[PDB]
Amino acid sequence: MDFLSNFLTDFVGQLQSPTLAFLIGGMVIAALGTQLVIPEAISTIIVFMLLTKIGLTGGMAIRNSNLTEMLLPVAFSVILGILIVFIARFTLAKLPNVRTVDALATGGLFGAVSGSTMAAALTTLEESKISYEAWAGALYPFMDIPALVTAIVVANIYLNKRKRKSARVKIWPIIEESLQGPALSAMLLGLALGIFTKPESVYEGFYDPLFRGLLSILMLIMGMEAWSRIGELRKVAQWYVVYSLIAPIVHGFIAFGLGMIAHYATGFSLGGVVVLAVIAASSSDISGPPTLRAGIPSANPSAYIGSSTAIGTPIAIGVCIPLFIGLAQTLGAG
Amino acid sequence: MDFLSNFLTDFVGQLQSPTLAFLIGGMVIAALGTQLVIPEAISTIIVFMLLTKIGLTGGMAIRNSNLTEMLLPVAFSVILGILIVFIARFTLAKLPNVRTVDALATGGLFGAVSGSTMAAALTTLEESKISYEAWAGALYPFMDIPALVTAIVVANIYLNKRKRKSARVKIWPIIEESLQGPALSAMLLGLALGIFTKPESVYEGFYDPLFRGLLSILMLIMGMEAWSRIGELRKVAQWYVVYSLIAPIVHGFIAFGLGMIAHYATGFSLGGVVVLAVIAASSSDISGPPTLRAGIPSANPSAYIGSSTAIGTPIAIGVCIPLFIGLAQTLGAG
Amino acid sequence: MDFLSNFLTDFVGQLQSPTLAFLIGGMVIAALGTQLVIPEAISTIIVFMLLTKIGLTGGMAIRNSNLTEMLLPVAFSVILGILIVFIARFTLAKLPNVRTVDALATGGLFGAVSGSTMAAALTTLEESKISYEAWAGALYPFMDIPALVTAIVVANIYLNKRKRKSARVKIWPIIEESLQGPALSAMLLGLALGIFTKPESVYEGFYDPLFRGLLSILMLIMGMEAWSRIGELRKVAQWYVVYSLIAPIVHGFIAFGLGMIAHYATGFSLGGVVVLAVIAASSSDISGPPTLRAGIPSANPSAYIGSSTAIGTPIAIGVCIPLFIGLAQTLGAG
Amino acid sequence: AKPANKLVIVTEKILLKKIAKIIDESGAKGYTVMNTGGKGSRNVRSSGQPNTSDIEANIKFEILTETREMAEEIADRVAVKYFNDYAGIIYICSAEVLYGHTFCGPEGC
Amino acid sequence: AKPANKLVIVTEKILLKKIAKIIDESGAKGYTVMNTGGKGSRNVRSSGQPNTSDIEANIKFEILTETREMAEEIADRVAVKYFNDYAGIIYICSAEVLYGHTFCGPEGC
Amino acid sequence: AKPANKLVIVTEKILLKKIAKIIDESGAKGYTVMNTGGKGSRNVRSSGQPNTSDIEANIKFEILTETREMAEEIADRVAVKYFNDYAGIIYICSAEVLYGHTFCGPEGC
Ligand SMILES: Nc1ncnc2c1ncn2[C@@H]1O[C@H](COP(=O)(O)O)[C@@H](O)[C@H]1O
Ligand SMILES: Nc1ncnc2c1ncn2[C@@H]1O[C@H](COP(=O)(O)O)[C@@H](O)[C@H]1O
Ligand SMILES: Nc1ncnc2c1ncn2[C@@H]1O[C@H](COP(=O)(O)O)[C@@H](O)[C@H]1O
Ligand code: NA
Ligand code: NA
Ligand code: NA
């Protein structure tokens, strides 16, 4: 009722803010040429030390708090990450010209989460003065690991009964290879240094001040990395453009209400529900497509990378972070 | 009259300040060996995000101001950038052992503007408490683009009538290749994000605090990049040492007084006149010599790079930024 | 007497602090895999601009002070750096299965210092509110250069009388190659810019704020670079594990008391004695290696690198920086 | 000058550890890998980092084998296992190894 | 093992897109470029970035062509067009392409 | 197509200036060096920077010499002087230099 009112004045205020302004600013210059490039050594130390901040601010507010409250949101993400790939197995794969191996790999990437679309939400939640739960940054590995592993298993149980029955996946080295990769071992280090040590002299002074600044450099990369794959999903069928444009809206609604069971059962933050939504509505595109290419080699990389970079991440930040902040700002306090 | 008084006490105070102290500090260590090197990934993110600050502080103070005042200084730079290459065509090229193709390419770089000699002036103008005009950083593309394009056209109209008449330049892909290059598309992004969006939470906090710090790393590179070409203009004739040592003084005097027409015609800042001088006296050496090597391939790169790096940029910062601050501090307010 | 009391409560408070927490945090993740890597372009600009801060804060407090006080500590380090390699020549080399060429090269690195193990002491001295002498950072050159040069000379005077007598070192290009290397010409630049210029607007604002933050990134590299060589000293004999685990304790005791002659003879800081102990108990592992491989090519690099990275630097920071802060906090003021 | 065969494998970057296992298990004395860029009409290159900073996105192995039948044993366990789904090209050149210890032996070449 | 010719072009870095147009227009199936450093008595190397961070300042193409007459067609449209004003060297080696799809065809090598 | 010999030296990174002195003193017209990574059972690689950021830790020279006896003169002054204590491998391939000025001469190839 009051929701279209507090979206359209919130979509504009999102678009004025530098966490989206540099994303569409990065797509505009990359559409015009621009031999400007941010080098790989800078992009690595910006994905690190942005997830170390998310880890340190999650580890500090997880040792002085009773960890009974965490039981519902870390179980509502394991369920939800497995749920996304089965939605793509019964909705996306059942179109006329689309392969099942690609549609499981596209839904595998949307099931995961990306730290770019996530850290864009953690600033915007505390820019609009909504007190979110601080350990919700530590909810990143859940619904990243069970979503990529239930796209490799399901694609093999499809591909076995096509050549063995019609014409075995080791479950641990999938999840002990994605766990000790970059951008996740940066945060698990940041968690364990917050639970056990006291890094409060280096958090406030290095990791917290240049967090919103380095996020803007990182949002500029993701805009240029979105235009570089916009000509790649014009190689596969037209239903991926429909999926990647609607599935951030659908996966977050069945993340919001599935996370509205919290703060009705155990005391949850209600600014953590919108964090749990933006993490469900965002698709992985840095740590994701290394897997689902060693795990699902028979898939088309132009079909799942071109959907989660070009259309998945700008819509998860443009029309989805203000879609769930305002809906949480309407339904309750903000 | 009072000008030699307020130069010699201003040249020393320039030389104590870190925006020149690291330049001569960078030449001293590079003269002594020093396998110290600042890598290319760090030098790229320092030329970016120093020109993004110049863009953001120019774009913020261009939307809340009537843009009638800009008409004289952005036309006095297009005239002046074309003027520099014709001065080198009738003064530098008319020496006994010098080629016309090289002298047009040497004057092509001095017409252009480098962001190193420019951002060194924008700090020193607000270190000596002289209120400069904030959009004068957006005057960078003018007198960078018409100066490089009127050195490629004039060198071809010389080289045509030497083999066709004695023994055609496509004007747009010269200026749509220098425009979407790095260090200029970094600033045009910074302009458009200042006019249209509101990046005031990331400007004060990331781009403004570590501006004067990253400038000192960048001045250290330019000192080491000046000693690496000091043995290169000992390969061409001795008149390039005379040109590159006098032309920053001459090109700025006919930039100061040509910009003294402003704040007599339309209200201009008088701390923007010295910004318009240091931009006219400075010579490009990062974005410049990619062009005038694809545009003028028959020139000697040892003749125009060795003059604008080794002698052009240390003199444009050492004896030229305090030469025009004090002259603006004498003639009027400071 | 009161020393085991003020060690065990100081070893824990060291281990909570991020200058050791990221070191053991870096070894734990590297023991578990972690394709996380900090790139070489970031590691170079962190070793630079951490030693520029040590240089600038040493150069500022060396021009307004009478430099008679410096005569004893800069002579007590030249004596001590030559002393370490002779201790390894008469203690480490006289074991059953150990080569003299390797034992001189292992003691050559322990003689030298390490900016990473020294930057960790300069924060912890001003974290526990102990007023250390500011020019003691300028003590890095001494006991780095005479320790590496008295391991190359002594190894050649051993290796000459084995093939010429049984079966010449140019002394200047050893010390004019280590002097104009990186991580030392970064600090000598920082000294000369502090003595002569006034970089107080760029020191407080760029080099001092993100000093303790970049140190934590650098301590994370040194932990991962310690686990990468922990499987390398299992290739040489077991007495290197004994040497590298005891020699940081022994070399600092005969640095503390040898530096206790100061502030009894000339007025020294007593927080500079613990700085002179840690600079003496640390090893090279970054600059030392390049030398003692061009200088002593017949040595085993698995024997001296594997001792000063894997066991030398974690013990010099874990059990040696709180060992000498508390001993200086017991014996006198803290 | 012991005559050898330079096997060259030019594939995607994400097969760095996987083909280096195939080289080590085949009995070759070693390899030499470097990061290259290319163009071959199968150009996608996931690679782990973002796309715009992929100046080099391939890897190029160079394996010097003593016999021809080992170089086609390495090249066959790669093209069967990876090149049906990944990018790549394999070719053999000729070379005479002058110096080296693991390839000559203690007697020399 | 389809016999091929490895054309190698080692030129300045600023000719990255320009020679890659010549390779694509000539009908070669692809190229492999990498960043190298060198020394050839024409050493200036503008290159876009500052000079001291030019550890590598050249580029090295490697084009495998099916016939000799295509490799000297690529090499001739470069040396006429660029090597009168730019640095460079071109040489042909010999190779036998074992695997690959665009170079063998669907029948294989 | 002037017939040449491609001498390739693949050694540790810290011998960058030292072998480049040997190449310049031998009378070769130039070299081409690039940073590679490898595996050869003498893998320590001090290299100056820390170990974990040593994605590439070797260097690879490629020297085109006019005569065979110069290429084995360069290769002999390296293996005697450095390969008794350092890592390395040297091999000669064959090549026909098509273009270039310092290698052909003004008359061309
Ligand atoms: N004819 C060729 N010459 C040189 N390199 C090639 C050739 N064909 C393919 N490549 C390289 O092989 C890799 C894979 O190409 P492709 O598998 O054909 O897409 C890329 O690095 C290409 O540059
Ligand atoms: N004889 C040679 N062997 C190997 N590389 C060479 C040779 N001559 C020139 N080059 C390379 O060719 C490029 C241009 O050299 P030049 O055009 O001779 O200045 C540089 O990358 C050199 O390293
Ligand atoms: N058989 C081989 N093929 C290719 N490269 C090799 C071979 N043997 C050694 N290398 C390279 O030679 C260098 C030194 O190896 P080594 O001296 O054998 O430890 C390393 O860069 C290795 O990758
Ligand atoms: Na998701
Ligand atoms: Na100019
Ligand atoms: Na020491």
Author numbering:
A (entry chain B), B (entry chain C), C (entry chain A): 1 to 167, 208 to 374
D (entry chain E), E (entry chain F), F (entry chain D): 2 to 110
Quote the study that presented this structure, word for word:
The sbtB gene from the sbtA–sbtB operon encodes a PII-like signaling protein that senses the intracellular level of the secondary messenger cAMP that correlates with high Ci conditions, versus AMP at low Ci conditions, thus functioning as a Ci sensor in cyanobacteria. In summary, this study provides structural insights into the cyanobacterial high-affinity HCO3– transporter SbtA, which exhibits a new architecture of Na+/solute symporters and its fine interaction pattern with a PII-like protein SbtB.
To elucidate the fine interaction mode between SbtA and SbtB, we purified the SbtA–SbtB complex in the presence of AMP and solved its 3.15 Å cryo-EM structure. The SbtB trimer is associated with the intracellular face of the SbtA trimer, sharing an overlapped threefold axis. Similar to the previously reported PII and PII-like structures, SbtB also adopts a trimeric structure, each subunit of which shows a canonical PII ferredoxin-like fold with a well-structured T-loop. In the complex, the core structure of SbtB does not directly interact with the intracellular surface of SbtA. Instead, the structured T-loop of SbtB, which extends ~20 Å from the core structure of SbtB, is inserted into the inter-domain cleft of the corresponding SbtA subunit, yielding an interface area of ~740 Å2. Similar to the complex structure of AmtB–GlnK, in which the T-loop of PII protein GlnK inserts deeply into the cytoplasmic pore exit of the ammonia channel AmtB11, the SbtA–SbtB structure showed that SbtB T-loop partially blocks the substrate tunnel exit of SbtA, indicating that SbtB might attenuate the transport activity of SbtA under certain physiological conditions. At the peripheral side of TM crossover within the center of SbtA core domain in the SbtA–SbtB complex, there is a clear cryo-EM density most likely corresponding to a sodium ion, given SbtA is a Na+-dependent transporter.
